[PDB]
Design an enzyme around this catalytic site. Structure first.
Site, PDB file in Angstrom:
ATOM      1  N   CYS B 141      70.929 -40.842  87.156  1.00  0.00           N
ATOM      2  CA  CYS B 141      69.592 -40.299  87.083  1.00  0.00           C
ATOM      3  C   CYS B 141      69.560 -38.801  87.316  1.00  0.00           C
ATOM      4  O   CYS B 141      69.149 -38.333  88.384  1.00  0.00           O
ATOM      5  CB  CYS B 141      68.656 -40.995  88.072  1.00  0.00           C
ATOM      6  SG  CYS B 141      66.869 -40.607  87.742  1.00  0.00           S
ATOM      7  N   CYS B 144      66.392 -37.616  88.820  1.00  0.00           N
ATOM      8  CA  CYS B 144      66.308 -37.995  90.222  1.00  0.00           C
ATOM      9  C   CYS B 144      67.007 -37.009  91.140  1.00  0.00           C
ATOM     10  O   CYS B 144      66.412 -36.542  92.115  1.00  0.00           O
ATOM     11  CB  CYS B 144      66.942 -39.361  90.435  1.00  0.00           C
ATOM     12  SG  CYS B 144      66.073 -40.706  89.605  1.00  0.00           S
ATOM     13  N   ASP B 145      68.265 -36.692  90.821  1.00  0.00           N
ATOM     14  CA  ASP B 145      69.145 -35.991  91.762  1.00  0.00           C
ATOM     15  C   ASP B 145      69.476 -34.508  91.473  1.00  0.00           C
ATOM     16  O   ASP B 145      70.062 -33.830  92.310  1.00  0.00           O
ATOM     17  CB  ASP B 145      70.445 -36.776  91.934  1.00  0.00           C
ATOM     18  CG  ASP B 145      70.201 -38.231  92.219  1.00  0.00           C
ATOM     19  OD1 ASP B 145      69.064 -38.551  92.631  1.00  0.00           O
ATOM     20  OD2 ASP B 145      71.133 -39.056  92.029  1.00  0.00           O
TER      21      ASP B 145
HETATM   22  C1  LIG Z   1      66.736 -44.577  89.376  1.00  0.00           C
HETATM   23  C2  LIG Z   1      65.409 -44.669  88.676  1.00  0.00           C
HETATM   24  C3  LIG Z   1      64.297 -43.971  89.147  1.00  0.00           C
HETATM   25  C4  LIG Z   1      63.092 -44.070  88.458  1.00  0.00           C
HETATM   26  N1  LIG Z   1      62.012 -43.395  88.905  1.00  0.00           N
HETATM   27  C5  LIG Z   1      60.840 -43.517  88.233  1.00  0.00           C
HETATM   28  C6  LIG Z   1      59.695 -42.832  88.653  1.00  0.00           C
HETATM   29  O1  LIG Z   1      59.716 -42.102  89.674  1.00  0.00           O
HETATM   30  N2  LIG Z   1      58.537 -43.013  87.982  1.00  0.00           N
HETATM   31  C7  LIG Z   1      58.485 -43.806  86.885  1.00  0.00           C
HETATM   32  O2  LIG Z   1      57.428 -43.947  86.239  1.00  0.00           O
HETATM   33  N3  LIG Z   1      59.583 -44.450  86.459  1.00  0.00           N
HETATM   34  C8  LIG Z   1      60.763 -44.338  87.110  1.00  0.00           C
HETATM   35  N4  LIG Z   1      61.833 -45.024  86.665  1.00  0.00           N
HETATM   36  C9  LIG Z   1      61.732 -45.890  85.453  1.00  0.00           C
HETATM   37  C10 LIG Z   1      61.028 -47.222  85.792  1.00  0.00           C
HETATM   38  O3  LIG Z   1      61.635 -47.815  86.946  1.00  0.00           O
HETATM   39  C11 LIG Z   1      61.032 -48.247  84.662  1.00  0.00           C
HETATM   40  O4  LIG Z   1      60.525 -47.655  83.464  1.00  0.00           O
HETATM   41  C12 LIG Z   1      60.210 -49.498  84.977  1.00  0.00           C
HETATM   42  O5  LIG Z   1      60.664 -50.137  86.182  1.00  0.00           O
HETATM   43  C13 LIG Z   1      60.221 -50.538  83.843  1.00  0.00           C
HETATM   44  O6  LIG Z   1      59.755 -51.692  84.532  1.00  0.00           O
HETATM   45  P1  LIG Z   1      59.651 -53.148  83.889  1.00  0.00           P
HETATM   46  O7  LIG Z   1      58.467 -53.803  84.503  1.00  0.00           O
HETATM   47  O8  LIG Z   1      59.773 -53.055  82.393  1.00  0.00           O
HETATM   48  O9  LIG Z   1      60.910 -53.966  84.409  1.00  0.00           O
HETATM   49  P2  LIG Z   1      62.087 -53.521  85.399  1.00  0.00           P
HETATM   50  O10 LIG Z   1      61.765 -52.705  86.624  1.00  0.00           O
HETATM   51  O11 LIG Z   1      63.174 -53.163  84.419  1.00  0.00           O
HETATM   52  O12 LIG Z   1      62.323 -54.949  86.101  1.00  0.00           O
HETATM   53  C14 LIG Z   1      62.860 -56.118  85.459  1.00  0.00           C
HETATM   54  C15 LIG Z   1      62.985 -57.158  86.570  1.00  0.00           C
HETATM   55  O13 LIG Z   1      62.979 -58.508  86.108  1.00  0.00           O
HETATM   56  C16 LIG Z   1      64.115 -59.186  86.638  1.00  0.00           C
HETATM   57  N5  LIG Z   1      64.764 -59.997  85.609  1.00  0.00           N
HETATM   58  C17 LIG Z   1      65.476 -59.541  84.566  1.00  0.00           C
HETATM   59  N6  LIG Z   1      65.906 -60.591  83.830  1.00  0.00           N
HETATM   60  C18 LIG Z   1      65.445 -61.707  84.440  1.00  0.00           C
HETATM   61  C19 LIG Z   1      65.562 -63.045  84.174  1.00  0.00           C
HETATM   62  N7  LIG Z   1      66.274 -63.457  83.102  1.00  0.00           N
HETATM   63  N8  LIG Z   1      64.946 -63.927  84.983  1.00  0.00           N
HETATM   64  C20 LIG Z   1      64.248 -63.533  86.050  1.00  0.00           C
HETATM   65  N9  LIG Z   1      64.126 -62.241  86.342  1.00  0.00           N
HETATM   66  C21 LIG Z   1      64.713 -61.321  85.550  1.00  0.00           C
HETATM   67  C22 LIG Z   1      65.112 -58.130  87.061  1.00  0.00           C
HETATM   68  O14 LIG Z   1      65.754 -58.556  88.262  1.00  0.00           O
HETATM   69  C23 LIG Z   1      64.253 -56.942  87.375  1.00  0.00           C
HETATM   70  O15 LIG Z   1      63.895 -57.006  88.759  1.00  0.00           O
HETATM   71  C24 LIG Z   1      62.992 -44.878  87.323  1.00  0.00           C
HETATM   72  C25 LIG Z   1      64.097 -45.568  86.882  1.00  0.00           C
HETATM   73  C26 LIG Z   1      65.304 -45.467  87.560  1.00  0.00           C
HETATM   74  C27 LIG Z   1      66.494 -46.253  87.066  1.00  0.00           C
END
Ligand SMILES: Cc1cc2nc3c(=O)[nH]c(=O)nc-3n(C[C@H](O)[C@H](O)[C@H](O)COP(=O)(O)OP(=O)(O)OC[C@H]3O[C@@H](n4cnc5c(N)ncnc54)[C@H](O)[C@@H]3O)c2cc1C
Ligand SMILES: Cc1cc2nc3c(=O)[nH]c(=O)nc-3n(C[C@H](O)[C@H](O)[C@H](O)COP(=O)(O)OP(=O)(O)OC[C@H]3O[C@@H](n4cnc5c(N)ncnc54)[C@H](O)[C@@H]3O)c2cc1C
Lengths: 318, 319
Positions: B141, B144-145
């Site tokens: 990231c 991030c860092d």
């Molecule tokens: C290091 C980092 C820092 C970030 N900081 C920011 C920020 O400050 N602000 C911001 O807007 N965005 C940030 N992001 C981006 C943001 O986190 C993502 O865009 C967002 O979380 C997408 O969320 P989502 O709901 O699509 O699913 P995700 O957060 O991708 O979650 C998917 C979840 O579902 C679960 N899962 C997956 N497959 C299965 C399965 N088959 N069965 C059951 N459960 C399952 C997984 O365990 C996971 O917990 C950051 C990303 C990273 C990597």
């Protein structure tokens, strides 16, 4: 359709595989070795590439970095004629001879095969675990325990095996207090090992629990505590701690074999004790992929040597 | 299995998207069943946000908020409105029949609609030194860092050839003394515009036809100090001093479990009808990063999860 043919095909790239390559090549068997392409999310060279300072591999009075030691082993294997494919093995066929070993790009027909794909330390992926990796959390209590950050502070160990018991004791030499955290109310470890840890003044067991979060301090500081959830009551508690270590075993790299070798229940290859012989004549297993007891570069090297000689001896009787 | 849970809406995943979908589905009295995973995909329930410490751009939190706390809140909110949350990972679905079948190791659910919101995971490489110097120089990231002291005025490396690599490279030249983009080929996958804005940058130098084969530290067991780079044409290996190395090689959408039953783009993301959460299968919806590689924010993913709930609610009413 253009299969490489070899007397000896070696799968893997740690000390075992390379010692096997060195002996097989020097015996003029022209081995083909698959060193992987980050196979199993470990660089070619094996687990030693994930550490910095190897001090107990005989021959290096001043120690040596894992990466350099493994660079040497490979240069040595190449020097004696080993043909090294930088490819991961995805499938084998042990039902016929010569044995068939294949990667994405290559197919080898081998008279013998040495499986030496090793293992990988297991970890959990609760919230905070990536975050505080190398900033408090680690999977090598013995690697990192001495370190300043942990001195005189509280440490946590997760696991219920013999490893957890011993790494716990080991850590009470550096920490102010050590907590073993385990999902059940009973330990998988030997009754002896359970006792030596349970008798320890500086160790406190945290039964029926899971870690659900690791958090830091400041100021984006290093590991400061963990949230622990009791699995009976459901209650979640903060538990201050400067270090958390994973002692939950190792994952032998045997899935690719698709069941074609007899395994113990923990996944390790069952070998004829005191040799590298497996359930299939002409197929041998050396190193951590068939040893959870010692798990050293030096033992694994020894075993790789044995796998070569065993294979050589099996070629002669065939 | 023989005692299947029946629900109007089954939600797979546990990030912002899944939880916002749960909050709406539950409040609309649809009694959703949500599979939050059990470290599914090697990410904690709660999603990628649990891998960061300080979220500053999710509207509503003037002082910022830690990812873990924000996602703790989302879940408590989902539960408060009736969501039934299984702490289990989904291993298989069946979208050929209705109701849809969704199953984990332990549970089987018969669902009138399904919301796939399993998100994605940043890709990394596992060359020698990569675990070793993780958080001690190496990271996935850049944004991030990058600001962090360790990197200030020192040289940084970025690996990748995408739009992300170009932009994270530029972003890093604001903090480092020099930035190196390292890519396996001699040509970039990124847009011709992005390639130009980076290639024009004074503080960026591209390292074509190369791979990083080792990262090493200093001292004294110090933090990241350099990387060995191998040219893939010549074969030569060179030391390249550097205080930071960042992965900009994309994200892996969590769609393998669907085993082909939804139409995917080639990069593996779920193909949705643009501007909605509709997928190739009537009654199945996709929200969040599992179908978005462009924005990739918690706030956009939350928005999309809301859409998935309302879309499904609207599809239940027409059925
Ligand atoms: C290091 C980092 C820092 C970030 N900081 C920011 C920020 O400050 N602000 C911001 O807007 N965005 C940030 N992001 C981006 C943001 O986190 C993502 O865009 C967002 O979380 C997408 O969320 P989502 O709901 O699509 O699913 P995700 O957060 O991708 O979650 C998917 C979840 O579902 C679960 N899962 C997956 N497959 C299965 C399965 N088959 N069965 C059951 N459960 C399952 C997984 O365990 C996971 O917990 C950051 C990303 C990273 C990597
Ligand atoms: C943190 C840490 C510190 C350690 N420190 C020491 C120490 O100081 N001293 C010591 O003696 N030991 C130490 N060890 C242990 C040592 O790493 C192992 O005991 C030893 O490496 C076992 O070697 P192996 O030959 O069985 O292969 P491993 O090192 O486990 O390597 C197996 C290799 O084969 C490759 N591979 C896997 N699957 C395939 C496939 N399908 N096709 C092709 N290739 C494949 C993998 O990429 C891996 O590189 C340490 C281990 C760790 C984790």
């Amino acid at each position: 359709a253009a299969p490489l043919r070899t007397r000896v095909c070696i799968i893997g790239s740690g000390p075992a595989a390379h010692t096997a390559a060195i002996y097989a090549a020097r015996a003029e068997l022209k081995p083909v070795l698959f060193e992987g392409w980050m196979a199993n999310d470990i660089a070619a060279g094996g687990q030693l590439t994930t550490t910095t300072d190897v001090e107990n591999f005989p021959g290096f009075p001043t120690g040596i970095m894992g990466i350099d030691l493994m660079d040497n082993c490979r240069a040595q294997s190449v020097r004696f004629g080993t043909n090294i494919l930088s490819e991961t093995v995805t499938e084998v066929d042990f039902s016929a001879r010569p044995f068939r070993v294949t990667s994405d790009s290559t197919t080898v027909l081998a008279d013998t095969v040495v499986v030496a794909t090793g293992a990988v330390a297991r970890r959990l992926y609760f919230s905070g675990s990536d975050t505080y990796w190398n900033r408090g959390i680690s999977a090598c209590a013995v690697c990192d325990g001495a370190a300043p950050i942990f001195r005189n502070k509280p440490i946590a160990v997760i696991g219920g095996g013999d490893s957890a018991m011993e790494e716990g004791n080991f850590l009470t030499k550096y920490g102010s207090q050590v907590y073993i955290i385990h999902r059940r109310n009973t330990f998988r470890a030997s009754k002896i090992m359970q006792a030596r840890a349970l008798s320890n003044p500086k160790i406190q067991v945290v039964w029926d629990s899971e870690v659900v979060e690791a958090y830091g301090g400041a100021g984006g500081g290093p590991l400061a505590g963990v949230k622990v959830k009791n699995l009976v009551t459901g209650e979640v508690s903060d538990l201050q701690v400067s270090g958390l270590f994973f002692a939950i075993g190792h994952e032998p790299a045997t899935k690719f074999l698709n069941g074609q070798l007899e395994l113990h229940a923990d996944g390790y290859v069952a070998t004829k004790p005191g040799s590298t012989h497996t359930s299939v004549e002409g197929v041998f297993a050396a190193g951590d992929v068939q040893d959870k007891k010692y798990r050293q570069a030096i033992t694994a090297a020894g075993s790789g040597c044995m796998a070569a000689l065993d294979a050589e001896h099996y070629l002669q009787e065939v």
